[model samples]
Target chain A: VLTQPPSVSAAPGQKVTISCSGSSSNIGNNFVSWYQQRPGTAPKILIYENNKRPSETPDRFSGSKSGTSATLAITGLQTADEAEYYCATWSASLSSARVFGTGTRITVLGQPKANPTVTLFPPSSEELQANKATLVCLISDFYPGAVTVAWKADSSPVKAGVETTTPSKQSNNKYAASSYLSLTPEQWKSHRSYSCQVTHEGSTVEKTVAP
Target chain B: VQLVESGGGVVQPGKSLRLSCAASRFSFNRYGMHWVRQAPGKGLEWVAAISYDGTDKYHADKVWGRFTISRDNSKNTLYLQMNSLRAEDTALYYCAKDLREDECEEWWSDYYDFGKQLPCRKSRGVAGIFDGWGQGTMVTVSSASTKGPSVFPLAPSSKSTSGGTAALGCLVKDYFPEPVTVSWNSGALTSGVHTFPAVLQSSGLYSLSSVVTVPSSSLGTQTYICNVNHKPSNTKVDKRVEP
Candidate 1:
């Protein structure tokens, strides 16, 4: 079986590492795999078989499985790296199946740690995708890179049509991320107000706009 | 390589149970084979492991004194010998190859001295990943045909096991159709409980067993029931002890 700690906390921009321990039967024989799971989306495999990363995986994530221990290291740690991670391995015996470690959440410590800049990009009046208006929430200059993006139709929270990106590193070593929310042209044309609330380092910064 | 298990189906309490794993098409090159066990639907317990040359062995704490492991150089077989079989020991046991192989030369060998056992209190093997498990063999320890369950002390030191902890057992000797059940405090025996299921004795009948753990703080007198639901015996047995 696999072993992992419950949770780990680190300040923004600080390196964070998680360890997965296995028995000689499985981890020693097969490849170790790591995954990331956010609250609303499906899990994404970050590292495979210890040290091998799929092409789209960012370079900041690295894995090392030597002997009975495998470590996942995230360098230049951003707030986006604050997510639940898991390690899995195929069962060592034919009769048994795959085994996985308990999940652990990476905490991006420090409140308002990143002084995030927020911008609202409105849907183009001239264009429509599937006849829906597109709204973008742009967040940048945040440390610890964790950005929580939420949409509000007036005062009510909008759960659908919201997608957030992982934090991207900036030249100054700060982080940036974005969220997208879509609405119908009629909803956009009405003199209704929409708010893009971006949470960076545990503080929320909101920008309101109307079409 | 494929591993197949060969062993007995039933073992009696106070007796030794021996099981074997024969590796066919197995490469002596891989790290080695390990023993895995499942008690009913419970999670897997990594029992222990052994190398090809008998240079290494890993023993899980639950199995330390109760089990012994040895391998034959030429038979391509690994053997598991467990003694003082308890009723809870009845389980499905399997053997499989550890894929991580011998990469453990560095991390594992440090503590394991060949010819000497290193009690692994914690789980070991990066490759606890197992493959090619043999069809399982079930070992049951039966005490049947009706007898009394010997209730006594746990961690017995000299004459007194009281004020420290309470270990209770209802030792029933040899009965047939081993239908038995035990209840403790409606779940208050929270520390641990073990029931040695009925096993056949040299006599025609079978013997049974059941035990309960009482915290040392609960050293005063306590009472519990052991119910034998079988038809020949409609028994309401309650025992009392202060320990």
Candidate 2:
């Protein structure tokens, strides 16, 4: 069950190729997917596991996988390659988490780098209010990457809020990050069962909010 | 599965000319057209090609400028033309259908199980190494000018790294006004990354150079492509970089 990095960079208008390796049948049922993420842009699904193309993908992008290794190649590179590249496996089970690889950061000419740390505010909290309630998820460490935060209510995905920020070095040489989500008071009452999810590197981490 | 252009035209030197080729019972946008030319009694010369997107044009060696290609979706005509021709430009031109379209279509449709299957038509389409080619047209550029050397420039003496900056210069001996492109590739690039030539002189005899700054990491290894996009198809040459 191996995956490639989230993003890999190349010179502007150059060709950049990324490779993903997985265990035999790791992709599950012969399906693998690839995605591209540019700064401030939503993750664009470039290739589906079935080798099917999404409607919006340009002809310049293509994907291939053999055995346990899959590859995503982009020709005529553009400034947009400065984001992350992610590959995920498909599953028939509804409850299974679609695993993703650690993202690859493709710099124009510099060494590779990882994204910043994201922290949730009020790590644990209980709030009783009117019909509407809001919970703030703050990412302290930030970088020049696209940041998005969402809330999962009763296992269903929901978009809460998102923001983008420049790469500001932190005391530890990393960056700072933060984000927030607002929910209805009824939603907040059930926040104990809800999970706040943060996505980076084409993977996600969800934490339960205390109620 | 044979593909060919519908028609072409003959133009005299010093005059502007436009010729078009249309494909029968095929989607022109999904395939490419290879342009070629032949003198009254000489061998055929490759010009350039246009892919489905209508972007990325490839030129032949020692040929550039003077020619342009455009297409109209409604008409399916692959348009080509040359300006201010010379005696050397006199050659037959042709547009041949790219056979890869059917191969690619079959490769992609293999995954689907739609109620109606793709007709398992015999691939009369050509494949493998590029060998058989289209019959070319003859255009005689008949002006009283010393015929320029038709040979392309020498290959690069040294190769550059993938990310390193490099350049290739092409000098045409006597003909004036040429267009060319330099290309880079990892393998024999059957498609993608076509370059347009630039004119560096005013006398008509064209000397063009293509410069590329290879990435620092990409240096050493990988193929660097440079092609001249000219009429009768563009000329192509490649060099492998070593670290």
Candidate 3:
């Protein structure tokens, strides 16, 4: 369970830190969670297991754990933190997977990766319309391990999605992947476009949502 | 003055939450206790914090095996139990403290009114981060009556070669009622609506500010965002500008 590498850069409000490492008997008691994914949205669970605040989290963000390693701090630094920051650990001998870490792509300072980044949460247009929609594609940090997530319509490739892979409490290190897609509502409004592709070591990144 | 607990949870939409925190008068051994969460309208979601002398723990990112954080110390209190709750496991919960010696010279110039007498401190140092925080509680999940999930903004952070006007802000200190957003992205600047700064603090934690102005040929590189959509952990933080 070790992490740090999906992308990380800061400037706006300042204070930005993301680190996760474990292996000493699961970092003692093991408990580190952090998530935030922009572009098309779905992956927000910032700092858990390191601190403890989940009723409506807000205090400038914070999480700390020393021994095996755990740190997820975010003060100021706005601009939506540029999406991408994941860290997770909690395995009683792998209970159906839950060990992410390989995400942290926070950019600021002349940002231009291609622009068009979006993160919708509560900004309803009728909750984006509903009828059976469960879109979850997480690709935290990144290293060695190969990530994957693809769900398109206008560009094809959409075969009822569902993918999951785990191993990050430091079993050699560098790994984090997740995918879950369920569409309906007329295939998400006649499938204008939908994408979430992430491949590691090989190099690949894609996030698209249009209609 | 210490009180922490917010770990030992997660079974995915199964539903089950148990959080705790209490450090009366002050004297939970030395001082230490933590548990943070904020998925319901994002920012500051760290579910786990403890130090009962040897109960050390810290877990995040995919929250390990449900979740757990414990402490008793006679009865000072500190716990967080989560077992199967989904909808992304709602957010907004707190109970922290780390202060030990410095006491910030009588606690930082009276430490802004010293609520319950103020104690939870950790301005960096060993714990590093949380600086005497606490005062955020909210948990919502509906199906019976159906109604839960509303709080947007997830894109912004691009622009700052050193042009001129620049702005980014996402503050949620004590979150009271609940309702926030401060988004802005730069790829080609897609989207609209920007301007926020009101809702002071009566413990409902609130502070917003978002401004963007950069041209000078795109400046440093271009990436600016300040997303803070809450209601189940919709948190984000980014900034880059240095030409």
Candidate 4:
């Protein structure tokens, strides 16, 4: 059985580590993979083939193994890092397979270090001919990233075709996010100014389209 | 989407029951197939799983050890074949779909990509669950023409230790015929694991037990499987390892 702490808490810029125990058949010989499963989201591998990480994965996230146990360590933790973490390994059963850890929750405690700056890049007039255009809301420089991007036309909220990306950690330690609002020519040509709102740490920054 | 489970729908004790799920009007490989069984008044139990890729995740229940869940990619279908069926195995089994979000890139490409690279895209775990669930297929197990004795198999694990010896037991009671075969699936498996000979139960049926001394390595992420051969058919039921 893989044993993990029920929950771990860390402040911004702090480091937290979780451990998993296994047998020689599992961890001692096979590679271990770590995943981040935010509430209501699919689990994504953080570190796979043992300590190897994805190109986009933050350098702060790492995995290590010794004997029949493996560890997942997250440094400079952020509130966005607060989520369920799981470890998985494979074995040859029937044909083949992967098994998961009991799972643990990492909570980013305390306050966010900074708020995001909202920037709106409206669709161009030529793009209006395509019947649909993409409106981008770039959320930048947020600490403890876990931000939301929202759209509004005048005073009413716009919900259709609006997509927000997960916030990625930047080289400077801050995080950046972006959202795209797909607009039909009818909406883009409405002559109405749209607003891109970035929300983080209980604060909302709205950037209305400029003339 | 419509999914149909086709099979013999009936099996005799110490025999094998095979069933298949054929998906229609749906993107077959788009989702993974999950076998869910409901025994009379019992809640839904996840019997086993098959991914779009060539992979399977079997369960720990005795019933799971008696069955093999397979996928036929070319046919856009899934399969569940269980050996040594008993009355308790009677149930309404349905096949459900899973998102298999690991194919997220390909799945997303099917839809329009905003052409934006969002490194932090968080997944909302719904990753395609039960959306295309198939109607239940009633599979009943009953007494068949009498067969004789029966035997089951056991195996050793690469990493076996004395810390814990997980026992996988197969019990066949009031079964037809006599003589059984007990063999193991994996041979490369090392020490700390052993199988006990079949013994007669007071109830009259035979019972076979395989004890696996699981080592530290398997505790975290590794798994193993032990199979028991059928009495009449000489078939095998392989059970996956679970901690």
Q: Point to the candidate with the largest TM-score.
A: 1
Candidate 4, TM-score vs. the true structure? 0.33
- Which lDDT tens digits does candidate 4 get at residues A1-211? 5555545666778888888886766666666767676654334557776788777679999899899889998999886787877776644342222356755767676544577765455554444554545565656677665665668887788877654555566767767666667677676667468888776554778877632
Locate the minimum summed-lDDT window of 10 residues in model 2 chain A.
A121-130
Which lDDT value does model 3 have at B146?
Answer: 16
What lDDT is reached at residue B72 by model 4? 80
By DockQ, the better pick of 1 and 2 is: 1
Candidate scoring better on TM-score of 1 and 4 = 1
Give the B-chain TM-score of model 4. 0.47
For each candidate, the DockQ is 0.03, 0.02, 0.04, 0.01
- Name the candidate that leads on DockQ: 3
Candidate lDDT scores, in order, read: 0.62, 0.48, 0.49, 0.59
lDDT of 4 by residue, B1-243 (tens): 678877856666677878888887877765667776654322244467765654435554656578878788789889888888776677778786653444533233233255664332323222223334566688777664444432222223222223454333222222444555433445545454434333322222443344445545554566566555564755456555443
Query: TM-score for all predictions?
Result: 0.35, 0.29, 0.29, 0.33
- Please provide, for model 3 over A40-103, each residue's C-alpha lDDT reduced to its tens digit, 9 standing for 90 to 100: 4344556666787655567788888898778888788777666667675644333322345655
- Report lDDT (Cα) of residue B83, candidate 3: 66
Which candidate leads in lDDT? 1
Q: What is each candidate's fraction of native interface contacts (fnat)?
A: 0.05, 0.00, 0.03, 0.00
Models sorted by lDDT, best on top: 1, 4, 3, 2
Q: Write the per-residue lDDT of candidate 1 for residues B1-243, one digit (tens) a residue.
A: 566777867667788889998877757445567776754422345577775456566676667788988778576778899888876576778776665545323324345556665533333343554545566677777654444333221221212234575454344433455565665555556455544334333332544444555554554445554433444565544443322
Better of 2 and 4 by TM-score: 4
Estimate the overall C-alpha local distance difference test score of candidate 2: 0.48
